[PDB]
Amino acid sequence: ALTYRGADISSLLIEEDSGVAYKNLNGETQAFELILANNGVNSIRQRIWVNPSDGSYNLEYNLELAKRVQDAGMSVYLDLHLSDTWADPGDQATPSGWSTTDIDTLAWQVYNYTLDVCNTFAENNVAVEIVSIGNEIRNGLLHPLGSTDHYDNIARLLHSGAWGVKDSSLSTTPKILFHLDNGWDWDAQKYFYDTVLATGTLLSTDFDLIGVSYYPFYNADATLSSLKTSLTNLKSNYGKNVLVVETDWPVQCSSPEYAFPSDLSSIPFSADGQETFLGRLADTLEDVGGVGIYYWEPGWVDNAGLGSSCEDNLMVDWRDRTVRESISVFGDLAA
Numbered sequence: 001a002l003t004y005r006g007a008d009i010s011s012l013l014i015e016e017d018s019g020v021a022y023k024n025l026n027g028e029t030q031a032f033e034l035i036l037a038n039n040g041v042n043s044i045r046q047r048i049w050v051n052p053s054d055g056s057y058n059l060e061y062n063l064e065l066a067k068r069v070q071d072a073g074m075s076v077y078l079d080l081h082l083s084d085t086w087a088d089p090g091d092q093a094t095p096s097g098w099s100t101t102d103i104d105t106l107a108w109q110v111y112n113y114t115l116d117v118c119n120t121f122a123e124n125n126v127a128v129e130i131v132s133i134g135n136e137i138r139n140g141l142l143h144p145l146g147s148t149d150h151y152d153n154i155a156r157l158l159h160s161g162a163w164g165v166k167d168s169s170l171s172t173t174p175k176i177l178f179h180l181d182n183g184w185d186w187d188a189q190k191y192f193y194d195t196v197l198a199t200g201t202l203l204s205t206d207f208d209l210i211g212v213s214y215y216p217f218y219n220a221d222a223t224l225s226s227l228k229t230s231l232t233n234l235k236s237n238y239g240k241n242v243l244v245v246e247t248d249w250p251v252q253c254s255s256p257e258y259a260f261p262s263d264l265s266s267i268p269f270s271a272d273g274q275e276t277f278l279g280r281l282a283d284t285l286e287d288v289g290g291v292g293i294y295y296w297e298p299g300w301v302d303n304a305g306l307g308s309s310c311e312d313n314l315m316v317d318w319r320d321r322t323v324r325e326s327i328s329v330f331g332d333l334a335a
Protein backbone atom coordinates (compact mmCIF):
# COMPACT_ATOMS: atom_id res chain seq x y z
CA ALA A 1 0.00 0.00 0.00
CA LEU A 2 1.02 3.59 -0.74
CA THR A 3 2.30 5.69 2.13
CA TYR A 4 1.07 8.98 0.60
CA ARG A 5 -2.44 9.21 -0.78
CA GLY A 6 -2.33 12.83 -1.82
CA ALA A 7 -3.79 15.86 -3.55
CA ASP A 8 -2.43 19.26 -4.49
CA ILE A 9 -5.15 21.78 -3.62
CA SER A 10 -3.12 25.02 -3.70
CA SER A 11 -5.91 26.89 -5.51
CA LEU A 12 -8.33 26.34 -2.64
CA LEU A 13 -7.98 29.71 -0.84
CA ILE A 14 -8.30 31.67 -4.11
CA GLU A 15 -11.34 29.63 -5.15
CA GLU A 16 -12.95 30.27 -1.72
CA ASP A 17 -12.19 34.00 -2.10
CA SER A 18 -13.98 33.82 -5.49
CA GLY A 19 -17.12 32.48 -3.78
CA VAL A 20 -16.57 28.74 -4.35
CA ALA A 21 -18.09 26.38 -1.80
CA TYR A 22 -17.86 22.65 -2.45
CA LYS A 23 -20.60 20.06 -2.04
CA ASN A 24 -19.53 16.62 -0.82
CA LEU A 25 -20.78 13.06 -1.60
CA ASN A 26 -23.40 13.51 1.16
CA GLY A 27 -24.81 16.49 -0.71
CA GLU A 28 -23.55 18.84 2.06
CA THR A 29 -21.42 21.96 1.80
CA GLN A 30 -18.08 21.21 3.43
CA ALA A 31 -14.55 22.58 3.49
CA PHE A 32 -12.64 20.94 0.62
CA GLU A 33 -9.74 19.63 2.74
CA LEU A 34 -12.25 17.86 5.04
CA ILE A 35 -13.94 16.29 2.00
CA LEU A 36 -10.57 14.88 0.96
CA ALA A 37 -9.60 13.73 4.45
CA ASN A 38 -12.93 11.90 4.84
CA ASN A 39 -12.42 10.21 1.49
CA GLY A 40 -9.04 8.66 2.10
CA VAL A 41 -6.55 11.42 1.27
CA ASN A 42 -3.82 11.62 3.94
CA SER A 43 -1.41 14.23 2.58
CA ILE A 44 -1.66 17.58 0.81
CA ARG A 45 0.81 19.21 -1.55
CA GLN A 46 1.03 23.02 -1.63
CA ARG A 47 2.95 25.24 -4.08
CA ILE A 48 4.88 28.16 -2.60
CA TRP A 49 5.95 31.30 -4.46
CA VAL A 50 8.50 33.80 -3.15
CA ASN A 51 7.37 37.40 -3.79
CA PRO A 52 4.29 37.25 -6.02
CA SER A 53 2.89 40.74 -6.56
CA ASP A 54 -0.69 39.75 -5.68
CA GLY A 55 0.25 37.44 -2.76
CA SER A 56 -0.86 34.22 -4.53
CA TYR A 57 0.67 31.08 -2.97
CA ASN A 58 3.06 33.16 -0.80
CA LEU A 59 4.29 32.13 2.68
CA GLU A 60 1.32 33.48 4.63
CA TYR A 61 -1.10 31.91 2.12
CA ASN A 62 0.55 28.54 2.70
CA LEU A 63 0.68 28.77 6.48
CA GLU A 64 -3.10 29.17 6.57
CA LEU A 65 -3.73 26.36 4.08
CA ALA A 66 -1.30 24.09 6.03
CA LYS A 67 -3.07 24.85 9.33
CA ARG A 68 -6.28 23.65 7.77
CA VAL A 69 -4.60 20.57 6.28
CA GLN A 70 -3.15 19.69 9.72
CA ASP A 71 -6.52 20.31 11.44
CA ALA A 72 -8.02 17.81 8.99
CA GLY A 73 -5.50 15.19 10.08
CA MET A 74 -3.37 15.25 6.91
CA SER A 75 0.37 15.67 6.32
CA VAL A 76 1.91 18.69 4.57
CA TYR A 77 4.20 18.66 1.49
CA LEU A 78 5.66 22.08 0.62
CA ASP A 79 6.47 22.43 -3.08
CA LEU A 80 8.88 25.35 -3.21
CA HIS A 81 8.87 26.85 -6.69
CA LEU A 82 11.74 29.21 -5.82
CA SER A 83 10.23 31.79 -8.15
CA ASP A 84 7.62 34.57 -7.92
CA THR A 85 5.35 32.68 -10.32
CA TRP A 86 4.97 29.20 -11.93
CA ALA A 87 8.20 27.23 -12.13
CA ASP A 88 8.17 24.43 -14.73
CA PRO A 89 10.54 23.12 -17.47
CA GLY A 90 9.78 26.26 -19.51
CA ASP A 91 10.02 28.86 -16.72
CA GLN A 92 12.46 29.19 -13.82
CA ALA A 93 12.59 32.92 -13.14
CA THR A 94 14.72 34.13 -10.27
CA PRO A 95 12.66 36.07 -7.71
CA SER A 96 12.74 39.85 -7.81
CA GLY A 97 15.58 40.96 -5.52
CA TRP A 98 17.63 37.74 -5.74
CA SER A 99 20.90 37.61 -7.64
CA THR A 100 21.21 36.96 -11.36
CA THR A 101 24.95 37.68 -11.41
CA ASP A 102 26.65 36.19 -8.29
CA ILE A 103 26.17 32.49 -7.47
CA ASP A 104 27.59 32.88 -3.93
CA THR A 105 24.96 35.52 -3.16
CA LEU A 106 22.16 33.48 -4.72
CA ALA A 107 23.17 30.31 -2.82
CA TRP A 108 22.98 32.26 0.45
CA GLN A 109 19.57 33.72 -0.57
CA VAL A 110 18.21 30.21 -1.25
CA TYR A 111 19.56 28.92 2.06
CA ASN A 112 18.12 31.89 3.98
CA TYR A 113 14.79 31.49 2.19
CA THR A 114 14.19 27.79 2.86
CA LEU A 115 15.36 28.22 6.48
CA ASP A 116 12.94 31.13 6.95
CA VAL A 117 10.03 29.17 5.38
CA CYS A 118 10.68 26.18 7.61
CA ASN A 119 11.23 28.23 10.77
CA THR A 120 7.97 30.08 10.07
CA PHE A 121 6.19 26.72 10.03
CA ALA A 122 8.09 25.60 13.20
CA GLU A 123 7.26 28.81 15.06
CA ASN A 124 3.55 28.12 14.36
CA ASN A 125 3.71 24.45 15.34
CA VAL A 126 2.95 23.09 11.87
CA ALA A 127 4.82 19.84 11.19
CA VAL A 128 5.85 19.39 7.58
CA GLU A 129 6.38 15.99 6.04
CA ILE A 130 8.08 16.76 2.73
CA VAL A 131 9.75 19.79 1.13
CA SER A 132 10.82 19.96 -2.53
CA ILE A 133 13.72 22.18 -3.45
CA GLY A 134 12.23 23.61 -6.61
CA ASN A 135 9.50 22.44 -8.97
CA GLU A 136 10.28 20.37 -12.13
CA ILE A 137 13.98 21.19 -12.10
CA ARG A 138 15.19 19.04 -15.00
CA ASN A 139 16.18 22.23 -16.88
CA GLY A 140 17.58 23.82 -13.71
CA LEU A 141 16.13 26.54 -11.52
CA LEU A 142 16.79 30.20 -10.74
CA HIS A 143 17.79 31.18 -14.27
CA PRO A 144 20.10 32.42 -15.48
CA LEU A 145 22.53 31.25 -12.76
CA GLY A 146 20.89 27.83 -12.36
CA SER A 147 20.50 26.90 -16.04
CA THR A 148 21.83 23.69 -17.53
CA ASP A 149 24.87 25.61 -18.71
CA HIS A 150 25.94 25.45 -15.05
CA TYR A 151 25.14 22.10 -13.43
CA ASP A 152 27.78 23.11 -10.84
CA ASN A 153 25.52 26.03 -9.94
CA ILE A 154 22.38 23.84 -9.96
CA ALA A 155 24.04 21.48 -7.46
CA ARG A 156 25.12 24.38 -5.24
CA LEU A 157 21.60 25.77 -5.15
CA LEU A 158 20.00 22.41 -4.41
CA HIS A 159 22.62 21.82 -1.70
CA SER A 160 21.88 25.23 -0.17
CA GLY A 161 18.11 24.84 -0.26
CA ALA A 162 18.29 21.39 1.31
CA TRP A 163 20.52 22.55 4.19
CA GLY A 164 18.18 25.46 4.86
CA VAL A 165 15.58 22.82 5.63
CA LYS A 166 18.04 20.71 7.68
CA ASP A 167 19.00 23.75 9.79
CA SER A 168 15.42 24.68 10.59
CA SER A 169 13.86 24.28 14.02
CA LEU A 170 11.14 21.89 12.86
CA SER A 171 11.05 19.22 15.60
CA THR A 172 11.28 16.51 12.96
CA THR A 173 13.19 17.46 9.81
CA PRO A 174 11.08 17.07 6.66
CA LYS A 175 12.01 14.58 3.98
CA ILE A 176 13.72 16.50 1.22
CA LEU A 177 12.46 15.79 -2.27
CA PHE A 178 13.85 16.58 -5.72
CA HIS A 179 11.18 16.83 -8.44
CA LEU A 180 11.57 16.36 -12.21
CA ASP A 181 8.94 16.29 -14.93
CA ASN A 182 8.62 13.37 -17.42
CA GLY A 183 8.90 10.59 -14.88
CA TRP A 184 8.40 8.02 -17.65
CA ASP A 185 11.63 9.13 -19.32
CA TRP A 186 14.46 7.24 -17.59
CA ASP A 187 17.30 8.62 -19.76
CA ALA A 188 16.29 12.21 -18.91
CA GLN A 189 16.05 11.43 -15.18
CA LYS A 190 19.41 9.62 -15.18
CA TYR A 191 21.20 12.38 -17.02
CA PHE A 192 20.10 14.95 -14.43
CA TYR A 193 20.83 12.96 -11.30
CA ASP A 194 24.17 11.58 -12.58
CA THR A 195 25.31 15.06 -13.59
CA VAL A 196 24.42 17.03 -10.46
CA LEU A 197 25.89 14.26 -8.25
CA ALA A 198 29.17 14.36 -10.23
CA THR A 199 29.77 18.06 -9.52
CA GLY A 200 30.91 17.34 -5.93
CA THR A 201 28.69 20.07 -4.49
CA LEU A 202 25.44 18.12 -3.96
CA LEU A 203 25.75 15.34 -1.37
CA SER A 204 24.09 11.97 -1.96
CA THR A 205 22.59 12.41 1.50
CA ASP A 206 21.12 15.86 0.72
CA PHE A 207 17.78 14.46 -0.53
CA ASP A 208 15.56 11.63 0.71
CA LEU A 209 12.90 11.32 -2.00
CA ILE A 210 12.71 11.38 -5.76
CA GLY A 211 9.45 12.75 -7.10
CA VAL A 212 8.22 12.79 -10.69
CA SER A 213 5.41 14.27 -12.71
CA TYR A 214 3.37 11.79 -14.74
CA TYR A 215 0.70 12.90 -17.22
CA PRO A 216 -0.95 10.93 -20.04
CA PHE A 217 -1.81 13.82 -22.34
CA TYR A 218 1.45 15.56 -23.46
CA ASN A 219 3.33 12.71 -25.14
CA ALA A 220 2.42 9.22 -26.37
CA ASP A 221 5.68 7.86 -25.02
CA ALA A 222 4.35 8.24 -21.45
CA THR A 223 3.36 4.57 -21.16
CA LEU A 224 2.83 2.99 -17.74
CA SER A 225 5.49 0.42 -18.70
CA SER A 226 8.14 3.14 -19.21
CA LEU A 227 7.12 4.78 -15.94
CA LYS A 228 7.57 1.41 -14.23
CA THR A 229 11.08 0.99 -15.66
CA SER A 230 12.09 4.55 -14.82
CA LEU A 231 10.82 4.35 -11.21
CA THR A 232 12.58 0.97 -10.74
CA ASN A 233 15.80 2.38 -12.12
CA LEU A 234 15.59 5.55 -9.99
CA LYS A 235 15.10 3.62 -6.75
CA SER A 236 17.87 1.09 -7.55
CA ASN A 237 20.43 3.58 -8.97
CA TYR A 238 20.14 6.33 -6.36
CA GLY A 239 18.84 4.43 -3.33
CA LYS A 240 15.88 6.72 -2.68
CA ASN A 241 12.16 6.14 -2.34
CA VAL A 242 10.21 7.32 -5.33
CA LEU A 243 6.76 8.78 -5.87
CA VAL A 244 4.47 10.53 -8.34
CA VAL A 245 3.90 14.08 -7.11
CA GLU A 246 1.66 15.31 -9.96
CA THR A 247 -0.81 13.56 -12.23
CA ASP A 248 -4.27 14.03 -13.82
CA TRP A 249 -6.80 12.12 -15.93
CA PRO A 250 -9.69 13.68 -17.91
CA VAL A 251 -13.42 13.25 -17.49
CA GLN A 252 -13.74 15.00 -20.85
CA CYS A 253 -11.17 15.39 -23.61
CA SER A 254 -12.86 15.91 -26.98
CA SER A 255 -9.84 17.00 -29.04
CA PRO A 256 -6.54 15.81 -27.52
CA GLU A 257 -3.44 17.53 -28.88
CA TYR A 258 -1.35 14.37 -28.44
CA ALA A 259 -2.16 10.69 -28.82
CA PHE A 260 -2.55 8.91 -25.45
CA PRO A 261 0.04 6.24 -24.59
CA SER A 262 -0.64 2.75 -25.96
CA ASP A 263 -1.13 0.97 -22.63
CA LEU A 264 -3.67 3.62 -21.48
CA SER A 265 -5.75 4.05 -24.64
CA SER A 266 -8.58 1.72 -23.49
CA ILE A 267 -9.28 3.86 -20.39
CA PRO A 268 -12.37 6.03 -20.84
CA PHE A 269 -12.68 9.76 -20.22
CA SER A 270 -15.04 9.80 -17.26
CA ALA A 271 -14.93 9.80 -13.47
CA ASP A 272 -14.80 5.98 -13.57
CA GLY A 273 -11.93 6.32 -16.06
CA GLN A 274 -10.06 8.55 -13.57
CA GLU A 275 -10.38 5.79 -10.98
CA THR A 276 -9.24 3.06 -13.38
CA PHE A 277 -6.24 5.16 -14.34
CA LEU A 278 -5.32 5.88 -10.72
CA GLY A 279 -5.84 2.21 -9.71
CA ARG A 280 -3.45 1.12 -12.44
CA LEU A 281 -0.96 3.85 -11.49
CA ALA A 282 -1.16 2.74 -7.84
CA ASP A 283 -0.65 -0.90 -8.75
CA THR A 284 2.29 0.13 -10.94
CA LEU A 285 3.87 2.02 -8.04
CA GLU A 286 3.16 -0.85 -5.64
CA ASP A 287 4.81 -3.32 -8.02
CA VAL A 288 7.98 -1.31 -7.87
CA GLY A 289 7.96 -0.32 -4.16
CA GLY A 290 6.97 3.32 -4.81
CA VAL A 291 5.42 5.22 -1.93
CA GLY A 292 3.00 7.85 -3.21
CA ILE A 293 0.67 9.55 -5.62
CA TYR A 294 -0.53 13.16 -5.52
CA TYR A 295 -3.47 14.06 -7.79
CA TRP A 296 -2.98 17.60 -9.13
CA GLU A 297 -5.66 20.26 -8.40
CA PRO A 298 -8.85 18.14 -8.24
CA GLY A 299 -10.99 21.16 -7.24
CA TRP A 300 -9.71 24.01 -9.42
CA VAL A 301 -13.16 24.80 -10.96
CA ASP A 302 -12.13 28.09 -12.70
CA ASN A 303 -9.44 26.11 -14.58
CA ALA A 304 -10.97 22.73 -15.39
CA GLY A 305 -8.48 21.94 -18.19
CA LEU A 306 -5.58 22.37 -15.75
CA GLY A 307 -3.37 23.68 -18.57
CA SER A 308 -3.83 20.69 -20.85
CA SER A 309 -5.73 20.39 -24.13
CA CYS A 310 -8.50 18.47 -22.34
CA GLU A 311 -11.71 20.22 -21.30
CA ASP A 312 -11.88 18.83 -17.77
CA ASN A 313 -9.43 16.98 -15.50
CA LEU A 314 -11.13 17.79 -12.20
CA MET A 315 -12.84 15.68 -9.55
CA VAL A 316 -15.39 18.49 -9.08
CA ASP A 317 -18.00 19.63 -11.64
CA TRP A 318 -17.52 23.36 -12.26
CA ARG A 319 -21.21 23.75 -13.21
CA ASP A 320 -22.47 22.92 -9.70
CA ARG A 321 -19.33 22.85 -7.53
CA THR A 322 -20.14 19.26 -6.52
CA VAL A 323 -17.53 16.52 -6.12
CA ARG A 324 -17.55 13.55 -8.52
CA GLU A 325 -17.30 9.96 -7.28
CA SER A 326 -13.59 9.89 -8.20
CA ILE A 327 -12.98 12.14 -5.16
CA SER A 328 -13.13 8.94 -3.04
CA VAL A 329 -10.77 6.90 -5.22
CA PHE A 330 -8.11 6.63 -2.49
CA GLY A 331 -10.63 5.42 0.08
CA ASP A 332 -12.12 3.04 -2.53
CA LEU A 333 -8.62 1.53 -3.06
CA ALA A 334 -8.35 0.90 0.66
CA ALA A 335 -11.45 -1.08 1.72
Ligand SMILES: *[C@@H]1O[C@H](CO)[C@@H](O)[C@H](O)[C@H]1NC(C)=O
Binds near residue numbers: 109
Ligand atom coordinates in the same frame (compact mmCIF):
# COMPACT_ATOMS: atom_id res chain seq x y z
C1 LIG B 1 21.10 35.68 4.93
O1 LIG B 1 20.49 36.05 6.15
C2 LIG B 1 21.40 36.65 7.05
C3 LIG B 1 20.69 36.87 8.37
O2 LIG B 1 20.88 35.72 9.17
C4 LIG B 1 21.91 37.97 6.51
O3 LIG B 1 22.88 38.51 7.40
C5 LIG B 1 22.51 37.79 5.12
O4 LIG B 1 22.76 39.06 4.56
C6 LIG B 1 21.59 36.94 4.22
N1 LIG B 1 22.31 36.60 2.99
C7 LIG B 1 21.94 37.14 1.84
C8 LIG B 1 22.84 36.94 0.66
O5 LIG B 1 20.89 37.78 1.71
Ligand SMILES: [Zn+2]
Binds near residue numbers: 282
Ligand atom coordinates in the same frame (compact mmCIF):
# COMPACT_ATOMS: atom_id res chain seq x y z
ZN1 LIG C 1 -2.85 -0.07 -3.24
Ligand SMILES: [Zn+2]
Binds near residue numbers: 013014017
Ligand atom coordinates in the same frame (compact mmCIF):
# COMPACT_ATOMS: atom_id res chain seq x y z
ZN1 LIG D 1 -8.58 34.69 1.32
Ligand SMILES: [Zn+2]
Binds near residue numbers: 086087090091
Ligand atom coordinates in the same frame (compact mmCIF):
# COMPACT_ATOMS: atom_id res chain seq x y z
ZN1 LIG E 1 5.66 28.05 -17.61
Ligand SMILES: [Zn+2]
Binds near residue numbers: 102104105
Ligand atom coordinates in the same frame (compact mmCIF):
# COMPACT_ATOMS: atom_id res chain seq x y z
ZN1 LIG F 1 30.12 37.41 -4.31
Ligand SMILES: [Zn+2]
Binds near residue numbers: 143144147
Ligand atom coordinates in the same frame (compact mmCIF):
# COMPACT_ATOMS: atom_id res chain seq x y z
ZN1 LIG G 1 17.14 30.02 -18.93
Ligand SMILES: [Zn+2]
Binds near residue numbers: 144145147149150
Ligand atom coordinates in the same frame (compact mmCIF):
# COMPACT_ATOMS: atom_id res chain seq x y z
ZN1 LIG H 1 25.23 31.47 -17.75
Ligand SMILES: [Zn+2]
Binds near residue numbers: 149150151152153
Ligand atom coordinates in the same frame (compact mmCIF):
# COMPACT_ATOMS: atom_id res chain seq x y z
ZN1 LIG I 1 29.38 26.91 -14.17
Ligand SMILES: [Zn+2]
Binds near residue numbers: 159
Ligand atom coordinates in the same frame (compact mmCIF):
# COMPACT_ATOMS: atom_id res chain seq x y z
ZN1 LIG J 1 28.05 22.25 2.04
Ligand SMILES: [Zn+2]
Binds near residue numbers: 185187188
Ligand atom coordinates in the same frame (compact mmCIF):
# COMPACT_ATOMS: atom_id res chain seq x y z
ZN1 LIG K 1 14.19 11.08 -23.38
Ligand SMILES: [Zn+2]
Binds near residue numbers: 166205206
Ligand atom coordinates in the same frame (compact mmCIF):
# COMPACT_ATOMS: atom_id res chain seq x y z
ZN1 LIG L 1 19.46 15.23 5.33
Ligand SMILES: [Zn+2]
Binds near residue numbers: 088136213246
Ligand atom coordinates in the same frame (compact mmCIF):
# COMPACT_ATOMS: atom_id res chain seq x y z
ZN1 LIG M 1 3.78 20.18 -13.33
Ligand SMILES: [Zn+2]
Binds near residue numbers: 018302
Ligand atom coordinates in the same frame (compact mmCIF):
# COMPACT_ATOMS: atom_id res chain seq x y z
ZN1 LIG N 1 -10.26 30.93 -9.52
Ligand SMILES: [Zn+2]
Binds near residue numbers: 317319320322
Ligand atom coordinates in the same frame (compact mmCIF):
# COMPACT_ATOMS: atom_id res chain seq x y z
ZN1 LIG O 1 -22.58 18.30 -11.87
Ligand SMILES: [Zn+2]
Binds near residue numbers: 275328
Ligand atom coordinates in the same frame (compact mmCIF):
# COMPACT_ATOMS: atom_id res chain seq x y z
ZN1 LIG P 1 -14.23 3.83 -6.77
